[PDB]
Amino acid sequence: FGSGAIGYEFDNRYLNNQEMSAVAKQRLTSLP
């Protein structure tokens, strides 16, 4: 059948947690 309001929010939340991991590897380094 079909209804995609919980498939959407779980997929949108998995890409959020994957994006959250990617921005936690960002470093503005502090050697010369």
Partner: protein, 226 residues
């Protein structure tokens, strides 16, 4: 400063920024604000125009010029004797000396009641438009360009539209050129190291150059033969 300050209009900085395709949404309006933040943060006294105005003090107060940014000295008009600074907490206030001044807004607060004073000050150089005019120094111009590129990239890094490696390169390159631009404007010319030489080499030390307009500061000290 070794080089002369030849003046150019603000849109000459926009030919240089819009060579970068990520800085193509920049304006004159954004170039105006980021220039004045840059001009201030460097604090180079060669970028300002030296002016002198005589104002009259009515009662320990006088109205300051509209373009004034920093006072070089205030002095009296009839004597030429310079005013130092107001350390008094109770200045023009009576109960039941060496003259002074104090400036907060567009008002100067002196120690003298009814007197005319000369004020030597610094202003910003303007255009035919009432807009700032910047040096054509390609060191100044490059690091003003790197200033605006670092303020625009900092917004874009907060938005997530710039790599942290990209901003780290811009923050590094602005950091080098800002010291090179400081040293370009501060380090004296050959003709200013001669006045520095004459102040430094003084057998009888001259310790009252503030009373004059620092006029005889770089004068050479001569000793008679005996």
């Amino acid at each position: 400063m070794v080089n002369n300050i030849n003046w150019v209009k603000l849109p000459v900085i926009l030919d240089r920024l819009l060579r970068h395709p990520l800085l193509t949404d920049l304006n004159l309006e954004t170039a105006i604000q980021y220039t004045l933040d840059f001009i201030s943060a460097m604090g180079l006294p060669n970028v300002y125009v030296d002016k002198i105005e005589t104002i009259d003090i009515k009662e320990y107060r006088g109205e300051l010029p509209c373009d004034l940014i920093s006072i070089n000295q205030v002095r009296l008009h009839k004597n030429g004797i310079a005013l130092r600074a107001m350390t008094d907490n109770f200045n023009a206030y009576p109960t039941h000396g060496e003259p002074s001044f104090k400036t907060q807004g567009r008002v100067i607060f002196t120690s003298i009641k009814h007197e005319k004073v000369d004020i030597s000050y610094k202003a910003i150089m303007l255009d035919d438009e009432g807009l700032p005019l910047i040096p054509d120094n390609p060191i100044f111009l490059k690091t003003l360009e790197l200033y605006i590129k670092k303020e625009w990239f900092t917004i874009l890094f907060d938005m997530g539209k710039i790599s942290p490696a990209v901003l780290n390169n811009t923050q590094q390159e602005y950091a080098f050129k800002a010291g090179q631009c400081n040293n370009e404007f501060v380090i004296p010319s050959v003709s200013e190291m001669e006045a520095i030489t004459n102040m430094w080499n003084q057998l009888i030390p001259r310790v009252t150059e503030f009373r004059r307009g620092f006029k005889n500061l770089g004068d050479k000290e001569y000793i008679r033969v005996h």
